[PDB]
Design an enzyme around this catalytic site. Structure first.
Site, PDB file in Angstrom:
ATOM      1  N   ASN A  66     -13.102   5.233  -1.478  1.00 42.29           N
ATOM      2  CA  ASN A  66     -12.988   4.575  -0.171  1.00 42.29           C
ATOM      3  C   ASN A  66     -14.266   4.791   0.625  1.00 42.29           C
ATOM      4  N   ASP A 123      -0.677  -0.278  -4.897  1.00 42.24           N
ATOM      5  CA  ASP A 123      -1.978   0.230  -5.325  1.00 42.24           C
ATOM      6  C   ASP A 123      -1.930   1.678  -5.874  1.00 42.24           C
ATOM      7  N   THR A 160      -7.155   3.434  -2.075  1.00 44.61           N
ATOM      8  CA  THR A 160      -6.791   2.065  -1.783  1.00 44.61           C
ATOM      9  C   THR A 160      -7.808   1.036  -2.300  1.00 44.61           C
ATOM     10  N   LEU A 168     -18.546   4.261 -24.295  1.00 41.84           N
ATOM     11  CA  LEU A 168     -18.859   3.414 -25.440  1.00 41.84           C
ATOM     12  C   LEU A 168     -19.651   4.156 -26.501  1.00 41.84           C
ATOM     13  N   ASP A 210       0.791  -1.221   0.000  1.00 43.60           N
ATOM     14  CA  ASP A 210       0.000   0.000   0.000  1.00 43.60           C
ATOM     15  C   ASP A 210       0.828   1.277   0.000  1.00 43.60           C
ATOM     16  N   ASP A 243     -21.040  10.327 -26.950  1.00 39.85           N
ATOM     17  CA  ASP A 243     -21.171   9.538 -25.727  1.00 39.85           C
ATOM     18  C   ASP A 243     -22.092  10.229 -24.751  1.00 39.85           C
ATOM     19  N   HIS A 260      -3.140  10.684  -0.904  1.00 35.89           N
ATOM     20  CA  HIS A 260      -3.202  10.220  -2.284  1.00 35.89           C
ATOM     21  C   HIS A 260      -4.665  10.297  -2.660  1.00 35.89           C
ATOM     22  N   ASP A 272     -22.206   5.741 -28.851  1.00 36.18           N
ATOM     23  CA  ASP A 272     -23.677   5.828 -28.835  1.00 36.18           C
ATOM     24  C   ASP A 272     -24.265   5.245 -30.123  1.00 36.18           C
ATOM     25  N   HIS A 276       1.380   8.583   5.269  1.00 39.35           N
ATOM     26  CA  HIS A 276       0.307   9.512   5.640  1.00 39.35           C
ATOM     27  C   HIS A 276       0.803  10.427   6.775  1.00 39.35           C
TER      28      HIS A 276
HETATM   29  C1  LIG Z   1     -15.150  -2.204 -18.962  1.00 39.70           C
HETATM   30  O1  LIG Z   1     -15.456  -3.590 -19.059  1.00 39.70           O
HETATM   31  C2  LIG Z   1     -16.734  -3.941 -18.585  1.00 39.70           C
HETATM   32  C3  LIG Z   1     -16.950  -5.454 -18.499  1.00 39.70           C
HETATM   33  O2  LIG Z   1     -16.850  -6.023 -19.789  1.00 39.70           O
HETATM   34  C4  LIG Z   1     -17.794  -3.293 -19.482  1.00 39.70           C
HETATM   35  O3  LIG Z   1     -19.003  -3.409 -18.755  1.00 39.70           O
HETATM   36  C5  LIG Z   1     -19.985  -4.263 -19.355  1.00 39.70           C
HETATM   37  O4  LIG Z   1     -20.636  -3.598 -20.432  1.00 39.70           O
HETATM   38  C6  LIG Z   1     -21.785  -4.198 -21.010  1.00 39.70           C
HETATM   39  C7  LIG Z   1     -22.444  -3.138 -21.911  1.00 39.70           C
HETATM   40  O5  LIG Z   1     -22.682  -1.913 -21.206  1.00 39.70           O
HETATM   41  C8  LIG Z   1     -22.785  -4.737 -19.960  1.00 39.70           C
HETATM   42  O6  LIG Z   1     -23.707  -5.599 -20.616  1.00 39.70           O
HETATM   43  C9  LIG Z   1     -25.055  -5.422 -20.096  1.00 39.70           C
HETATM   44  O7  LIG Z   1     -25.357  -6.428 -19.140  1.00 39.70           O
HETATM   45  C10 LIG Z   1     -26.630  -6.334 -18.524  1.00 39.70           C
HETATM   46  C11 LIG Z   1     -26.705  -7.388 -17.421  1.00 39.70           C
HETATM   47  O8  LIG Z   1     -25.664  -7.065 -16.522  1.00 39.70           O
HETATM   48  C12 LIG Z   1     -25.660  -7.867 -15.318  1.00 39.70           C
HETATM   49  O9  LIG Z   1     -24.909  -9.070 -15.456  1.00 39.70           O
HETATM   50  C13 LIG Z   1     -23.499  -8.922 -15.616  1.00 39.70           C
HETATM   51  C14 LIG Z   1     -22.856 -10.305 -15.799  1.00 39.70           C
HETATM   52  O10 LIG Z   1     -22.688 -11.016 -14.586  1.00 39.70           O
HETATM   53  C15 LIG Z   1     -22.897  -8.099 -14.461  1.00 39.70           C
HETATM   54  O11 LIG Z   1     -21.532  -7.840 -14.690  1.00 39.70           O
HETATM   55  C16 LIG Z   1     -23.638  -6.769 -14.261  1.00 39.70           C
HETATM   56  O12 LIG Z   1     -23.103  -6.108 -13.127  1.00 39.70           O
HETATM   57  C17 LIG Z   1     -23.331  -4.677 -13.153  1.00 39.70           C
HETATM   58  O13 LIG Z   1     -24.393  -4.245 -12.314  1.00 39.70           O
HETATM   59  C18 LIG Z   1     -24.259  -4.488 -10.910  1.00 39.70           C
HETATM   60  C19 LIG Z   1     -25.190  -3.553 -10.141  1.00 39.70           C
HETATM   61  O14 LIG Z   1     -26.453  -3.481 -10.760  1.00 39.70           O
HETATM   62  C20 LIG Z   1     -22.844  -4.285 -10.335  1.00 39.70           C
HETATM   63  O15 LIG Z   1     -22.600  -5.238  -9.321  1.00 39.70           O
HETATM   64  C21 LIG Z   1     -21.676  -4.325 -11.328  1.00 39.70           C
HETATM   65  O16 LIG Z   1     -20.666  -3.480 -10.813  1.00 39.70           O
HETATM   66  C22 LIG Z   1     -22.071  -3.908 -12.748  1.00 39.70           C
HETATM   67  O17 LIG Z   1     -22.352  -2.517 -12.755  1.00 39.70           O
HETATM   68  C23 LIG Z   1     -21.794  -1.778 -13.871  1.00 39.70           C
HETATM   69  O18 LIG Z   1     -22.438  -2.031 -15.126  1.00 39.70           O
HETATM   70  C24 LIG Z   1     -23.796  -1.586 -15.243  1.00 39.70           C
HETATM   71  C25 LIG Z   1     -24.365  -1.987 -16.608  1.00 39.70           C
HETATM   72  O19 LIG Z   1     -24.622  -3.376 -16.616  1.00 39.70           O
HETATM   73  C26 LIG Z   1     -23.896  -0.075 -14.972  1.00 39.70           C
HETATM   74  O20 LIG Z   1     -25.237   0.359 -14.948  1.00 39.70           O
HETATM   75  C27 LIG Z   1     -23.240   0.288 -13.633  1.00 39.70           C
HETATM   76  O21 LIG Z   1     -23.139   1.682 -13.506  1.00 39.70           O
HETATM   77  C28 LIG Z   1     -21.830  -0.283 -13.500  1.00 39.70           C
HETATM   78  O22 LIG Z   1     -20.977   0.503 -14.305  1.00 39.70           O
HETATM   79  C29 LIG Z   1     -25.149  -7.019 -14.137  1.00 39.70           C
HETATM   80  O23 LIG Z   1     -25.430  -7.627 -12.887  1.00 39.70           O
HETATM   81  C30 LIG Z   1     -27.728  -6.469 -19.585  1.00 39.70           C
HETATM   82  O24 LIG Z   1     -28.986  -6.340 -18.962  1.00 39.70           O
HETATM   83  C31 LIG Z   1     -27.558  -5.416 -20.699  1.00 39.70           C
HETATM   84  O25 LIG Z   1     -28.502  -5.655 -21.749  1.00 39.70           O
HETATM   85  C32 LIG Z   1     -29.335  -4.510 -22.126  1.00 39.70           C
HETATM   86  O26 LIG Z   1     -28.904  -3.854 -23.317  1.00 39.70           O
HETATM   87  C33 LIG Z   1     -28.860  -4.734 -24.441  1.00 39.70           C
HETATM   88  C34 LIG Z   1     -28.182  -4.076 -25.642  1.00 39.70           C
HETATM   89  O27 LIG Z   1     -27.411  -5.062 -26.296  1.00 39.70           O
HETATM   90  C35 LIG Z   1     -30.253  -5.283 -24.797  1.00 39.70           C
HETATM   91  O28 LIG Z   1     -30.145  -6.338 -25.735  1.00 39.70           O
HETATM   92  C36 LIG Z   1     -30.995  -5.807 -23.562  1.00 39.70           C
HETATM   93  O29 LIG Z   1     -32.362  -5.929 -23.889  1.00 39.70           O
HETATM   94  C37 LIG Z   1     -30.816  -4.919 -22.317  1.00 39.70           C
HETATM   95  O30 LIG Z   1     -31.665  -3.782 -22.441  1.00 39.70           O
HETATM   96  C38 LIG Z   1     -32.663  -3.741 -21.387  1.00 39.70           C
HETATM   97  O31 LIG Z   1     -32.234  -3.040 -20.222  1.00 39.70           O
HETATM   98  C39 LIG Z   1     -32.002  -1.649 -20.431  1.00 39.70           C
HETATM   99  C40 LIG Z   1     -31.321  -1.039 -19.208  1.00 39.70           C
HETATM  100  O32 LIG Z   1     -32.042  -1.381 -18.043  1.00 39.70           O
HETATM  101  C41 LIG Z   1     -33.322  -0.960 -20.807  1.00 39.70           C
HETATM  102  O33 LIG Z   1     -33.123   0.412 -21.063  1.00 39.70           O
HETATM  103  C42 LIG Z   1     -33.932  -1.622 -22.049  1.00 39.70           C
HETATM  104  O34 LIG Z   1     -35.191  -1.037 -22.343  1.00 39.70           O
HETATM  105  C43 LIG Z   1     -33.996  -3.158 -21.893  1.00 39.70           C
HETATM  106  O35 LIG Z   1     -35.018  -3.532 -20.991  1.00 39.70           O
HETATM  107  C44 LIG Z   1     -26.100  -5.396 -21.224  1.00 39.70           C
HETATM  108  O36 LIG Z   1     -25.845  -6.487 -22.086  1.00 39.70           O
HETATM  109  C45 LIG Z   1     -22.093  -5.461 -18.785  1.00 39.70           C
HETATM  110  O37 LIG Z   1     -22.998  -5.745 -17.737  1.00 39.70           O
HETATM  111  C46 LIG Z   1     -20.947  -4.631 -18.219  1.00 39.70           C
HETATM  112  N1  LIG Z   1     -20.226  -5.362 -17.186  1.00 39.70           N
HETATM  113  C47 LIG Z   1     -19.723  -4.791 -16.083  1.00 39.70           C
HETATM  114  C48 LIG Z   1     -18.982  -5.667 -15.108  1.00 39.70           C
HETATM  115  O38 LIG Z   1     -19.851  -3.598 -15.822  1.00 39.70           O
HETATM  116  C49 LIG Z   1     -17.474  -1.832 -19.704  1.00 39.70           C
HETATM  117  O39 LIG Z   1     -18.241  -1.354 -20.769  1.00 39.70           O
HETATM  118  C50 LIG Z   1     -15.994  -1.548 -20.024  1.00 39.70           C
HETATM  119  N2  LIG Z   1     -15.746  -0.114 -20.132  1.00 39.70           N
HETATM  120  C51 LIG Z   1     -15.231   0.395 -21.266  1.00 39.70           C
HETATM  121  C52 LIG Z   1     -15.014   1.886 -21.353  1.00 39.70           C
HETATM  122  O40 LIG Z   1     -14.930  -0.316 -22.235  1.00 39.70           O
HETATM  123  O1  LIG Z   2      -4.800  -0.724   4.755  1.00 35.63           O
HETATM  124  C1  LIG Z   2      -5.890  -0.167   4.392  1.00 35.63           C
HETATM  125  N1  LIG Z   2      -7.102  -0.876   4.466  1.00 35.63           N
HETATM  126  C2  LIG Z   2      -6.921  -2.226   4.986  1.00 35.63           C
HETATM  127  C3  LIG Z   2      -7.347  -3.425   4.122  1.00 35.63           C
HETATM  128  O2  LIG Z   2      -8.783  -3.344   4.087  1.00 35.63           O
HETATM  129  C4  LIG Z   2      -6.941  -4.692   4.876  1.00 35.63           C
HETATM  130  C5  LIG Z   2      -7.377  -5.959   4.165  1.00 35.63           C
HETATM  131  N2  LIG Z   2      -6.928  -5.963   2.761  1.00 35.63           N
HETATM  132  C6  LIG Z   2      -6.226  -7.058   2.292  1.00 35.63           C
HETATM  133  O3  LIG Z   2      -5.940  -8.035   2.993  1.00 35.63           O
HETATM  134  O4  LIG Z   2      -5.844  -7.004   0.946  1.00 35.63           O
HETATM  135  C7  LIG Z   2      -6.589  -7.893   0.105  1.00 35.63           C
HETATM  136  C8  LIG Z   2      -6.081  -7.746  -1.309  1.00 35.63           C
HETATM  137  C9  LIG Z   2      -4.697  -7.700  -1.577  1.00 35.63           C
HETATM  138  C10 LIG Z   2      -4.263  -7.588  -2.902  1.00 35.63           C
HETATM  139  C11 LIG Z   2      -5.241  -7.510  -3.905  1.00 35.63           C
HETATM  140  O5  LIG Z   2      -4.708  -7.389  -5.160  1.00 35.63           O
HETATM  141  C12 LIG Z   2      -4.895  -8.365  -6.052  1.00 35.63           C
HETATM  142  F1  LIG Z   2      -6.139  -8.774  -6.120  1.00 35.63           F
HETATM  143  F2  LIG Z   2      -4.576  -7.989  -7.270  1.00 35.63           F
HETATM  144  F3  LIG Z   2      -4.162  -9.419  -5.718  1.00 35.63           F
HETATM  145  C13 LIG Z   2      -6.614  -7.558  -3.663  1.00 35.63           C
HETATM  146  C14 LIG Z   2      -7.030  -7.686  -2.341  1.00 35.63           C
HETATM  147  C15 LIG Z   2      -7.297  -4.774   1.982  1.00 35.63           C
HETATM  148  C16 LIG Z   2      -6.841  -3.508   2.683  1.00 35.63           C
HETATM  149  C17 LIG Z   2      -5.780   1.235   3.953  1.00 35.63           C
HETATM  150  C18 LIG Z   2      -4.642   1.574   3.230  1.00 35.63           C
HETATM  151  C19 LIG Z   2      -4.362   2.811   2.767  1.00 35.63           C
HETATM  152  C20 LIG Z   2      -5.234   3.816   3.085  1.00 35.63           C
HETATM  153  N3  LIG Z   2      -5.221   5.189   2.787  1.00 35.63           N
HETATM  154  N4  LIG Z   2      -6.388   5.717   3.338  1.00 35.63           N
HETATM  155  N5  LIG Z   2      -7.099   4.803   3.963  1.00 35.63           N
HETATM  156  C21 LIG Z   2      -6.419   3.535   3.847  1.00 35.63           C
HETATM  157  C22 LIG Z   2      -6.716   2.200   4.325  1.00 35.63           C
HETATM  158 CA   LIG Z   3     -22.278   5.834 -24.968  1.00 33.38          CA
END
Ligand SMILES: *[C@@H]1O[C@H](CO)[C@@H](O[C@@H]2O[C@H](CO)[C@@H](O[C@@H]3O[C@H](CO[C@H]4O[C@H](CO)[C@@H](O)[C@H](O[C@H]5O[C@H](CO)[C@@H](O)[C@H](O)[C@@H]5O[C@H]5O[C@H](CO)[C@@H](O)[C@H](O)[C@@H]5O)[C@@H]4O)[C@@H](O)[C@H](O[C@H]4O[C@H](CO)[C@@H](O)[C@H](O)[C@@H]4O[C@H]4O[C@H](CO)[C@@H](O)[C@H](O)[C@@H]4O)[C@@H]3O)[C@H](O)[C@H]2NC(C)=O)[C@H](O)[C@H]1NC(C)=O
Ligand SMILES: O=C(NCC1(O)CCN(C(=O)OCc2ccc(OC(F)(F)F)cc2)CC1)c1ccc2[nH]nnc2c1
Ligand SMILES: [Ca+2]
Ligand SMILES: [Cl-]
Ligand SMILES: [K+]
Ligand code: NA
Ligand SMILES: [Zn+2]
Length: 806
Positions: free
Chosen positions: A180, A308, A159, A689, A121, A683, A420, A691, A265
């Site tokens: 964070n 990190d 972090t 991505l 870290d 965009d 940071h 539009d 820090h």
């Molecule tokens: C960086 O890389 C990443 C990973 O590759 C890129 O992100 C992907 O981009 C894809 C396109 O945007 C996207 O695909 C969509 O998936 C939808 C289902 O998603 C769920 O399942 C996946 C798989 O397990 C999962 O990863 C998703 O997790 C997201 O959401 C939860 C919280 O809700 C979070 O835990 C997680 O962090 C993640 O959030 C992020 O992504 C979402 C978008 O999914 C953002 O909203 C968040 O802000 C955050 O950034 C999900 O659990 C699927 O439903 C989509 O399909 C819609 O669109 C297609 C068009 O092809 C259409 O066919 C479908 O009908 C559908 O449309 C319907 O829904 C619309 C919206 O509600 C609605 O308007 C319409 O009317 C329709 O009803 C789509 O295929 C993929 O999920 C993400 N993956 C991740 C991890 O983010 C990213 O683009 C890259 N960045 C760059 C710059 O390149």
């Molecule tokens: O130390 C801090 N927080 C304490 C922790 O929560 C303790 C537990 N922990 C852990 O054990 O690490 C897990 C891990 C390791 C590598 C990895 O990398 C991977 F995936 F690529 F391997 C992915 C996951 C994460 C950090 C912290 C630091 C600096 C700050 N500045 N300001 N506030 C701060 C708070």
């Molecule tokens: Ca776009």
């Protein structure tokens, strides 16, 4: 509830997690207040310290000891790490000459070289050089293995966003850990460093390496360590896990150090108090490597030493206070410090207005040390917008400063001297990468790269298929001896049309005029050749970009430039041209000032029109290939074709004109010619991505001409600048930008001055990777070069940062 009545007898640091209320014995039970009553007794032994001494050799196994120097300790997998050194006359790993590891040298029953991630870290990139005298073990890893001069973290350079980016290969906006500290309005829940909500699975998106591994049959050590478990115990635990039977033994492990961040820090990145924490980290690396040597694993395991983020000098007196700008300071909630995020304190306040808040924060004080942005106006290279947890209002804080709501927040919440979180291009935020092992290269330096790329490599190292992520798989093949990932170029989806002359001038009713009615097979056979692509090898140096989505477009050739013209968006997707070192800049002739010419290759119905620009009082237009750089007076007429025109706010034309009239020639002069590819980006949902047409929120008034959110340029030349851009026999050099297409220049506080005082600074801030432009346009560049595809992938991930030497 936990019924802590069970025992940890024989279960110390068990790898599977038993469900409540059975008591836990894993390295996270402390953090859950769920360890069995005897966890400390049995699992956190400390008796006799961590090192074997002369008098301990051959001892009778005393189970109370933290580690052992008894004769059976090797086979029990639980010697002190210096056992063979003290007791068996062996040398420390750091004292051995390094010898290339051409093949993995593993004990029988190892199916693959294990991977150990040693993450540190706040380990600033310059520590590698500046602390090299007190870090012999780290310096040996670095010099004998593969290392980069630095690794770029993600924004914000905090972090949790960074460790989770390392684990997932995702931008924070996609993985969900966007700081964070966070508020998720949908959950109506808050995430903090201290507390229990952060343990809730809903915060953590994507698929981290330990889950990727597990699902594909590769066992993982538990990545997370409770703060109270000392470093020596973490090392001994990993080493013990490595002595497990084949069927139980993990293949991937993580160690984590809270240092040097903790001390940085308090003391600043280079405080004299920082030497000791660096020595201490080094000693821990030595303990691991000695431990691996004892297990005959030191030429089997791949070790990654990674940070990190870095650390900057920041003190309490360098705090900006929002109360010095806002009258209504109590109607806002601020996420404070090295970044700012603002939202309304109460959703029931309908007198909250983000536009008035931004205006109150914009260029209000001469030396102002933060800049407000609506999140969609942040530099696209930050990829920090597409998540509901990221507040619409953002403050980019100058390095060395903090922002806070009111002075009382600082003195009643100087303590600290380092922090940071700043913009991830800042030198002080850069961190470290070293790879050492059979799968990494020997004594090899690689260029700086982004931490989003590592997840793919860690998957490659373990033979796993990575989950979809933001790395560019293959861009880091040059780090690896073997296990490389040989990507193919994506297939073109839409093939271009090659229109010839199909329309008469009078078929157009665009409201455009040009004073071009001024008139010989000498020059007339010649101009025919130019419209068929006779000079195409000059202006299109790396093949045409491929269009990776379904659309309808035309390739248009000209003397001085070539374009891919979208019949759907009514403008080029890309315009390619080469400007040699010898090229001359001319001005637009007086008569030709407002000249726009119909393109007889392209139908009126698929053309823009000048009337729309006349009627739209906000919108003017610019050209993608600049008339200033035309090769000849006659070639200049091509630059005024309606198919070279794009919509531009007058405020933005100030930026664009200076780039085209001044900077392109400056770059050609400096780089010995440049090839330029420019075009529009749309965009509107700020997801990084391209539009689709139904996503466009703004058109030139009374028309179907869509308004770009951004304009890009990719400027390529020969890495060996003794060769001109158009006759380059080797690797290429690139810089790119994605400029926000904004109706004002509020972003640039110096914009009332001459463009030479502010435009280039704006452009530098909006530097970009070719890959960022690919995502935003659905185009694939550099399809026809003499270079290997992996090298081109590396080029496409390059970011020109404009920072000084690290
Ligand atoms: C960086 O890389 C990443 C990973 O590759 C890129 O992100 C992907 O981009 C894809 C396109 O945007 C996207 O695909 C969509 O998936 C939808 C289902 O998603 C769920 O399942 C996946 C798989 O397990 C999962 O990863 C998703 O997790 C997201 O959401 C939860 C919280 O809700 C979070 O835990 C997680 O962090 C993640 O959030 C992020 O992504 C979402 C978008 O999914 C953002 O909203 C968040 O802000 C955050 O950034 C999900 O659990 C699927 O439903 C989509 O399909 C819609 O669109 C297609 C068009 O092809 C259409 O066919 C479908 O009908 C559908 O449309 C319907 O829904 C619309 C919206 O509600 C609605 O308007 C319409 O009317 C329709 O009803 C789509 O295929 C993929 O999920 C993400 N993956 C991740 C991890 O983010 C990213 O683009 C890259 N960045 C760059 C710059 O390149
Ligand atoms: O130390 C801090 N927080 C304490 C922790 O929560 C303790 C537990 N922990 C852990 O054990 O690490 C897990 C891990 C390791 C590598 C990895 O990398 C991977 F995936 F690529 F391997 C992915 C996951 C994460 C950090 C912290 C630091 C600096 C700050 N500045 N300001 N506030 C701060 C708070
Ligand atoms: Ca776009
Ligand atoms: Cl934060
Ligand atoms: K106008
Ligand atoms: Na301004
Ligand atoms: Zn920190």
């Amino acid at each position: 509830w936990t019924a802590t009545s069970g025992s940890c007898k024989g279960r110390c640091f068990e790898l599977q997690e038993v469900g409540p209320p059975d008591c836990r014995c894993d390295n996270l039970c402390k953090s859950y207040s769920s360890c069995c009553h005897d966890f400390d007794e049995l699992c956190l032994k400390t008796a006799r310290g961590w090192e074997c001494t002369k008098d301990r050799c051959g001892e009778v196994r005393n189970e109370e000891n933290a580690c052992h120097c008894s004769e059976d300790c090797l086979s029990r997998g639980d010697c002190c790490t210096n056992y063979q050194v003290v007791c068996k006359g062996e040398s420390h790993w750091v004292d051995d000459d390094c010898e290339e590891i051409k093949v993995p040298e593993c004990p029988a029953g190892f199916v693959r070289p294990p991977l150990i991630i040693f993450s540190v870290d706040g380990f600033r990139a310059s520590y590698m050089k500046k602390g090299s005298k007190v870090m012999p073990n780290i310096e040996k890893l670095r010099s004998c293995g593969t290392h980069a001069p630095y690794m770029r973290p993600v924004y914000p350079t905090k972090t949790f966003p960074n460790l989770y980016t390392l684990a997932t290969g995702l931008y924070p906006e996609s993985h969900g850990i966007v700081g964070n500290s966070m508020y998720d309005p949908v959950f109506d829940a808050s995430f903090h460093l201290r507390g229990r909500e952060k343990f809730n699975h809903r915060w953590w998106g994507g698929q981290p390496l330990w889950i990727t591994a597990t699902k594909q049959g590769v066992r993982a050590g538990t990545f997370f360590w409770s703060v109270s478990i000392p470093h020596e115990r973490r090392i001994l635990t990993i080493l013990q896990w490595l002595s497990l039977p084949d069927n139980e033994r993990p293949s991937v492990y993580a160690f984590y150090s809270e240092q040097p961040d903790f001390s940085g820090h308090k003391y600043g990145p280079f405080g004299p108090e920082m030497t000791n924490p660096l020595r201490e980290i080094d000693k821990t690396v030595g303990q691991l490597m000695d431990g691996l040597k004892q297990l005959r694993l030191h030429r089997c395991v791949n070790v990654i030493f990674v940070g990190d983020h870095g650390m900057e000098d920041v003190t309490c007196d360098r705090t900006e206070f929002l109360s010095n700008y806002l009258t209504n300071v109590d109607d806002i909630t601020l996420v404070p410090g090295t970044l700012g995020r603002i939202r309304a304190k109460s959703i029931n306040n309908s007198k909250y207005d983000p536009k008035t808040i931004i205006a109150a924060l914009t260029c209000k004080k001469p030396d102002q040390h933060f800049k407000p942005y609506m999140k969609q106006h942040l530099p696209k290279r930050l990829h920090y917008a597409n998540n509901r947890r990221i507040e619409d209002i953002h403050l980019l804080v100058d390095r060395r400063w903090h922002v806070a709501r009111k002075p009382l927040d600082v003195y009643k919440k100087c303590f600290f001297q380092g922090d940071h979180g700043f913009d991830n291009k800042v030198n002080s935020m850069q961190t470290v990468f070293v790879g050492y092992g059979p799968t990494f290269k020997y004594r090899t330096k690689v260029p700086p790269f982004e931490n989003i790329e590592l997840y793919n490599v860690m998957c490659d190292l373990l033979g796993l298929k990575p989950a979809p992520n933001n790395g560019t798989h293959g861009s880091l093949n040059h780090l690896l001896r073997t296990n490389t990932f040989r990507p193919t170029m994506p297939d073109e989806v839409s093939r271009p049309n090659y229109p010839g002359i199909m329309y008469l001038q009078s078929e157009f009713d665009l409201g455009c005029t040009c004073d071009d009615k001024v008139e010989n097979k000498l020059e007339e056979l010649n101009k025919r050749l130019h419209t068929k692509g006779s000079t195409k090898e000059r202006h299109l140096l790396y093949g045409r970009p491929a269009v990776l989505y379904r659309t309808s477009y035309d390739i248009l050739y000209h003397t001085d430039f070539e374009s891919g013209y979208s019949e759907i968006f009514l403008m080029p997707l890309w315009t390619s041209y080469t400007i040699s070192k010898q090229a001359e800049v001319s001005s637009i002739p007086e008569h030709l000032t407002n000249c726009v010419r119909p393109d007889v290759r392209v139908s009126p119905g698929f053309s823009q029109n000048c009337l729309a620009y006349k009627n739209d009082k906000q919108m003017s237009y610019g050209f993608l290939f600049p008339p200033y750089l035309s090769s000849s007076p006659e070639a200049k007429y091509d630059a005024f074709l309606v198919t070279n025109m794009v919509p531009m706010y007058p405020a933005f034309k100030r930026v664009w004109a200076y780039f085209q009239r001044v900077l392109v020639k400056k770059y050609a002069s400096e780089r010995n010619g440049v090839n330029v590819i420019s075009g529009p980006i749309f965009d509107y949902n700020y997801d990084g991505l391209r539009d689709t047409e139904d996503e466009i929120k703004q058109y030139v008034e009374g028309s179907s001409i869509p308004v770009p959110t951004h304009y890009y340029s990719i400027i390529t030349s020969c890495l060996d600048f003794t060769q001109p851009a158009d006759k380059c026999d080797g690797p290429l050099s690139v810089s790119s930008f994605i400029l926000p297409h904004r109706p004002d220049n509020d972003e640039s506080c110096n914009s009332s001055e001459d463009e030479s005082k502010w435009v280039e600074e704006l452009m530098k801030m909006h530097t970009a990777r070719v890959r960022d432009i690919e995502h935003l346009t659905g185009l694939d560049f550099y399809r026809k070069t003499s270079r290997s595809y992996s090298e081109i992938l590396t080029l496409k991930t390059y970011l020109h940062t404009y920072e000084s030497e690290i």
